[PDB]
């Protein structure tokens, strides 16, 4: 029945960056969540504990932002070089996202 738990599900799409492992380093492919009296029953005669201390990532994950950017800048005057500074402000802020 416990094999019917672990084989009724298709492994998902995403590969994580850091993976949970043993002290040996074998990766873990699942999580059981039980109540307390069921866990005491399963750990006497039906299962075996093979490890106690695991390797676990600590940092959260971050992103690469490539967002649609918005430009609002006041311009004093109507000249060619003074209106191109709105255009320079696009590549000034798109550089800061790098």
């Amino acid at each position: 029945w416990l094999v019917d738990l672990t084989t009724a599900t298709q492994p998902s799409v995403a590969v994580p960056r850091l993976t949970h492992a043993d002290t040996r380093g074998r990766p873990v492919d699942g999580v059981l969540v039980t109540t307390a009296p069921i866990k005491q029953r399963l750990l006497q005669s039906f299962l075996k504990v093979e490890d106690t201390e695991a390797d676990v990532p600590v940092t959260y994950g971050e992103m690469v932002l490539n967002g649609a950017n918005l430009v609002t800048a006041l311009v004093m005057g109507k000249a060619v070089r003074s209106l191109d500074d709105v255009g320079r402000h696009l590549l000034e802020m798109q550089e800061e996202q790098l």
Partner: protein, 49 residues
């Protein structure tokens, strides 16, 4: 304002490349290929018993 982002923690598995010679079934074959089969009419295989 529509922001486009991308994760850095999780990457997909798009293709699952299955080769037939990775399988256990490839014993029961004799996988010899032609690069010309469509040009061939009735081919024959002989047995002497």
């Amino acid at each position: 304002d529509v922001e486009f982002d991308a994760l850095l923690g999780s990457y997909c598995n798009t293709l699952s490349l299955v080769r037939f010679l990775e399988l256990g079934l490839s014993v029961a074959c004799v996988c010899t290929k032609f690069p010309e089969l469509a040009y061939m009419n009735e081919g024959r295989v002989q047995f002497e018993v």
